[PDB]
From a paper:
SIDT2 mainly localizes to the lysosomal membrane. It can facilitate the uptake of naked single-stranded (ss) oligonucleotides into cells, and mediate RNA/DNA uptake by lysosomes during RNautophagy/DNautophagy. We first solved cryo-EM structures of SIDT1 and SIDT2 at overall resolutions of 3.33 Å and 3.17 Å, respectively. The electron density maps exhibited well-defined main-chain connectivity and side-chain densities in the ECDs, while the TMDs have relatively lower quality and resolution. Both SIDT1 and SIDT2 form homodimeric structures involving their ECD and TMD, exhibiting a high degree of symmetry with a two-fold rotational axis perpendicular to the membrane surface. SIDT2 also contains ten predicted N-glycosylation sites, with all six glycosylation sites on its ECD well resolved in the EM map, along with the corresponding disulfide bonds. Furthermore, SIDT2 features an additional β-strand (residues 27–33) involved in interactions at the dimer interface, while the corresponding region in SIDT1 remains unstructured, indicating a high level of flexibility and fewer interactions at the dimer interface of SIDT1 compared to SIDT2. In the SIDT2 ECD model, the dimerization interaction involves a buried surface area of ~1700 Å2 from each protomer, in contrast to ~1300 Å2 in the SIDT1 model, indicating differences in the proximity of the formed homodimers between SIDT1 and SIDT2, probably due to sequence variations. In contrast, SIDT2 relies more on interactions between TM2 and TM6 for dimerization. Cryo-EM structures of SIDT1 and SIDT2 show highly conserved features despite only 57% sequence identity.
Human SIDT1 and SIDT2 are closely related members of the SID-1 transmembrane family, and have been implicated in various biological processes such as glucose and lipid metabolism, innate immunity, and tumorigenesis. Here, we present the cryo-electron microscopy (cryo-EM) structures of human SIDT1 and SIDT2. Both structures reveal an overall architecture of a dimeric arrangement composed of an extracellular domain (ECD) rich in β-strands and a transmembrane domain (TMD) with 11 passes, highlighting the remarkable structural congruence. Importantly, the ECDs of SIDT1 and SIDT2 bind synthetic plant-derived miRNA only under acidic conditions.
Numbering used by the authors:
A (entry chain B), B (entry chain A): 25 to 317, 461 to 532, 547 to 596, 609 to 626, 630 to 652, 686 to 817
The structure:
């Protein structure tokens, strides 16, 4: 019959042995565990012979679960590709023990059916750093045939943590998943998307884990390295189309550093809420003291957020995963809260103009400004709902109405619904989507600027300088193209808005009309505020042009009060900038 | 050491044997295969002892692949549920053989680490009906621990086929997937969504398979039965929340009948195109003879269609999978083509009114009708783009503008943009979403009907009868509620449109004005056409209220020319009905 050989081998020892169609090798391993200190066990095997027909079959048997594979392991690409790996390392799943100290046995068996010998080296390692300590960085190497996973044990008094994993070289692609502590652990390429919360990453990833979702007060962080970098956004290699010939990928590896850090406590929310309310209520107090002296987008966003919450797939929404603090079912509560200033400040504009109008009516004994105020209020709803799940499908509304508001300003400089609709449809056309665009957009910009100047000695030279600087900005955008058209469009919009604001001031200076102190302070304050507003807008925390794995590279931590990142500062300063721009028009 | 026993057993024989922590059993099986006739091998094992701690570990070793499991198998639910199964059956994957006749060996090994005996019965069956013959129905039983799969070999001269699988009892839920013929086959619960094209189903499913995507001229149909019916849309059982106690599900089984049938050939496409063009060009010929005598929805739909095409997940779009014939990258080309009548017939309306207007101007020597014609043309784009991937996220536009067009008709009966916008926003509000709705909707309907009658002896009695029948329809909708509000809204809209059409005719009859022959024929023809149009609309081929697995139950085959289903007939007759309704207004 078949010859079976047995050995009671030990940890930390590479055994080199031969196997053919006749030999079956059994290795028994004893392992010591305790309830307080749990440590993982890793099986690592190499094959030093090249066989394409009959591989070696390895099985690892435990008390509860069994695992099995074949080496040289063959993984699958995209177009019926076959990648060959010779080294495979896997970490066994050990269910939590009941008794204080129980000795666990596990067996490793080797077999094959090839008619010729084959040499393999096998080693079992007692993985020392199985448990992840809070606030400590651990670096490890993973390839496509060597998935890894570490157990993190929620400390006493921690509500939730964040797992941050970073890498230096962007490629190869990888998947980082969080799973509950229950055998078995899905660390293979095909079942890694079954349960848990997973993110595909190339350089950086961050996953927020809560204790309410894990009753056992622990979880597993599983890292897997893909074979083809198409998911991360790379360019697939143009290897010959071999249907039944496996091609080796050479040396592909990923070095990753993982750190689990406690998240913000409840104070961060209270300080962030009090700070936001304190800033905007100060304008209400100041105005009282002075007086004394989209639906379909909402449905899509809600559906996508529910899909993210229930599926565990975190590749749908483009959050700022490094600084995004959840509350309830909302995954990034600070991003929603940052738009509260739109509501309060737009409503303050309605108060101030209502006071002005009633004063004028009493003395005697405005619709466009109301439209701008209502647009500002609508920002606080539409942009807030967008940030519940940012994506390329529903991105236009985040900045579109903003351009629309600018139009109203321009209209009050020219002195309605038709021009607003034209602006909305042009924004939709432009954001539907590219060197041909890079050229046609510049041509259309030049033509539109010339026509706008024509419709409007000092004036002709002034418009010539405006067109010259506009063409300079167009060439700037065309040459390097460091950012998307979405940022560029808002940039040219605000620059042209301040540009026309300055032209009106210059026309006033050429006349004998003297600007009062209040409008002068208003224009200066609005301009300086818009400065930092554009500064923070040009950061680009998350970009939706590329794959989400790439979009994760530009995440940055919380900057203000440990609650708000740069985009929230953009919201905060954009609200003030529009308030000042409107007050410039009102008091002009 | 460990005691290993060996036996060279045979097919079609149940072996009952005992295993404990000391015994390891090996069974060698010889198998005969040929290139022309490939037949599958199934391993079936039962355990007759109840053990919760230490299960039996079974491994099946082949020349190329290894498989392993443990019984009593434990599957996972939704809220850390554990279901226990005692019978497991799996079909081995056999790579295609090179030589004409090669004998394949495979081994089955049994082990366990429990300190007490355990009895198991194991049997290997040479599955006779492994290959699926075209146009033949095969019935089989699958449970959650007994996934099955059959090989379908594309015949000579068949471009593409459709796999139709049906069941009688709606539960339990299941997943039906199509995969290429390459070891291994992902028939487990966790990896069934890795590759291939898969649909979750409860009663019916249909998957279209093409030869260009399968270079080996064959594929695998894999059926898996889930554990919890939440995905299919059922109600989860309220078993006690046992974290570490597995609960048996009793006897859960699914009987399925599968049939692979060649798809429509190239002629059906040509006959369908010539039929569609022939119908609409006949109206152009008739008019010449008589004369001689949304963007964001488009982006979302495109993204979802690409996601379906590349992911293999067919649960995103709610097609009529029984009658949906693809072409190029489009998955249901007939559904898109059925809207061509909107374009042609709306454009014919523009021709006829342009002729009428130029005749009037020449004799002397209309904007609202143009708006309706343009709305009809816009249907042919918006509804066509919707049908590329129907879903609850983009459904509003499929029927929304429909009511909007009706409004224009009503307006020309009352004799614009404001009422149209009000109708659009009310449709959005109503379709955002429910007994509270079932009552409030009826109340609002009654109030709106009364107000509309008030704004408009014979008249008062006439409006009283109209309100009475409208309340009758409201009670009809409220009592049984067999369909969604989406069908009901269009139903009441068209009924009220014909109702006002008839009221105007009655007002004409009460006067001495005699209706000319042409308008009388027009009203009669429009009414009879709208009859069958509503008849075909009330069918409900696909409903998006429930889960897609349930939405698949109401699929029906092609009815007209083997290319068009009922919804295409609804499109065809709705186009004619609006053309007749418009011609009624023009010649009134
Ligand atoms: C686990 O098993 C190993 C394998 O037998 C044990 O290692 C042996 O221990 C004895 C006791 O001192 C030595 O005499 C042998 O030389 C060891 N084997 C080898 C290959 O060196 C080990 O002791 C076991 N663990 C425990 C806790 O008993
Ligand atoms: C991860 O892999 C890298 C690359 O093999 C390792 O870096 C090498 O480490 C060895 C041992 O210290 C050095 O001799 C080489 O010079 C290093 N090469 C490079 C390019 O850095 C790294 O040590 C591995 N990390 C771990 C934790 O094993
Ligand atoms: C496959 O293996 C089985 C198991 O040995 C073979 O069955 C035996 O065949 C011989 C030849 O006639 C009989 O004398 C034995 O009694 C059979 N075994 C049993 C348990 O009945 C079978 O012949 C093999 N297949 C082929 C094609 O040789
Ligand atoms: C699928 O399972 C059903 C239910 O067990 C089988 O139906 C039974 O078949 C046996 C054998 O003919 C009869 O004695 C029972 O009366 C049947 N019960 C019912 C409720 O129909 C059915 O035969 C199985 N199908 C297959 C292909 O095995
Ligand atoms: C079977 O193989 C084992 C493994 O090397 C060996 O120790 C044993 O002597 C062999 N038995 C026979 C009868 O050759
Ligand atoms: C394990 O830790 C618990 C408290 O964390 C302690 O009570 C117990 O004594 C520890 N076990 C041992 C063996 O020290
Ligand atoms: C703990 O050990 C005792 C004796 O060593 C044994 O009887 C008991 O079954 C063990 N606990 C478990 C959960 O097996
Ligand atoms: C494998 O190696 C051993 C020792 O070198 C040798 O005796 C044996 O014949 C080899 N196997 C085969 C199939 O030749
Ligand atoms: C080992 O177990 C096998 C299986 O029953 C048996 O045939 C054999 O006699 C046993 N050997 C010893 C030494 O007990
Ligand atoms: C298998 O089929 C091919 C053609 O389909 C035929 O040429 C060949 O002879 C067949 N093989 C045998 C063993 O008959
Ligand atoms: C086919 O059989 C011959 C002799 O029986 C053998 O030499 C050859 O290797 C076999 N083909 C394959 C692909 O193994
Ligand atoms: C299993 O059954 C055999 C035969 O009845 C018996 O000899 C053996 O002792 C049993 N196993 C144990 C662990 O008692």
């Amino acid at each position: 019959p078949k010859n079976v050989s047995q050995k009671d081998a030990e940890f930390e020892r590479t055994y080199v042995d031969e196997v053919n169609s006749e030999l079956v090798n059994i290795y028994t391993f004893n392992h010591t565990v305790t309830r307080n200190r749990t440590e993982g066990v890793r099986v690592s095997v190499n094959v030093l012979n090249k066989q394409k027909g009959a591989p070696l079959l390895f099985v690892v048997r435990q008390k509860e679960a069994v695992v099995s594979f074949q080496v040289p392991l063959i993984l699958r690409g995209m177009f019926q590709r076959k990648y060959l790996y010779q080294k495979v390392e896997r970490t066994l799943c050990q269910p939590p023990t009941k008794n204080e100290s129980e000795i666990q046995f596990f067996y490793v068996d080797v077999s094959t059916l090839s008619p010729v010998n084959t040499t393999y080296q096998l080693r079992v390692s007692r993985m020392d750093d199985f448990v992840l300590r809070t606030g400590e960085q651990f670096s490890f190497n993973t390839t496509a045939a060597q998935p890894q996973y570490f157990k993190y044990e929620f400390p006493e008094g921690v509500d939730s943590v964040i797992v941050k994993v970073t890498s230096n070289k962007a490629f190869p692609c990888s998947v980082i998943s969080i799973q509950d502590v229950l055998c078995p652990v899905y660390d293979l390429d095909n079942n890694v998307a079954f349960i848990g919360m997973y993110q595909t990453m190339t350089k950086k990833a961050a996953i927020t884990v809560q204790r309410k979702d894990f009753p056992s007060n622990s979880f597993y962080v599983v890292v897997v390295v893909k074979t083809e970098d198409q998911a991360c956004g790379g360019s697939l290699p143009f290897y010959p189309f071999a249907e039944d010939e496996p091609v080796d990928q050479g040396h592909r590896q990923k070095t990753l550093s993982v750190l689990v850090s406690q998240a913000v406590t409840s104070e961060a929310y209270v300080s962030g809420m009090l700070f936001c309310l304190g800033i905007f209520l100060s304008f209400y107090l100041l105005t009282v003291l002075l007086a004394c002296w989209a639906l379909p987008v909402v449905q899509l966003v809600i559906t996508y957020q529910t899909v993210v919450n229930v599926t565990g797939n975190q590749d749908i929404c483009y959050y700022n995963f490094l600084c995004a603090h959840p509350l309830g079912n909302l995954s990034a509560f600070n991003n929603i809260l940052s738009n509260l200033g739109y509501i309060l400040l737009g409503l303050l504009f309605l108060l101030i103009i209502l006071q002005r109008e009633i004063n004028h009516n009493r003395a005697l004994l405005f619709g466009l400004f109301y439209a701008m105020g209502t647009a500002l209020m609508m920002e606080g709803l539409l942009s807030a709902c967008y940030h519940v799940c940012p994506n390329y499908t529903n991105f236009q509304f985040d900045t579109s109405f903003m351009y629309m508001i600018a139009g109203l300003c321009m209209l009050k400089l020219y002195q309605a619904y038709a021009c607003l609709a034209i602006v909305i449809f042009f924004s939709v056309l432009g954001v539907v989507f590219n060197t041909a665009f890079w050229i046609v957009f510049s041509i259309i910009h030049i033509i539109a600027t010339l026509l706008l100047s024509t419709q409007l000695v000092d004036r002709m030279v002034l418009l010539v300088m405006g067109n010259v600087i506009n063409w300079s900005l167009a060439a700037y955008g065309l040459i390097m193209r460091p950012n998307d058209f979405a940022s560029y469009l808002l940039a040219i919009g605000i620059c042209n808005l301040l540009l026309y604001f300055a032209f009106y001031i210059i026309m006033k200076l050429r006349s004998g009309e003297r600007i009062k102190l209040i409008p002068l302070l208003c224009i200066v304050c609005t301009s300086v505020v818009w400065g930092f507003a554009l500064f923070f807008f040009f950061q680009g925390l998350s970009t939706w042009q590329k794959t989400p794995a790439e979009s994760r590279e530009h995440n940055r931590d919380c900057i203000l009060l440990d609650f708000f990142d740069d985009h929230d500062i953009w919201h905060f300063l954009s609200s003030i900038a529009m308030f000042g721009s409107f007050l410039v028009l009102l008091t002009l």
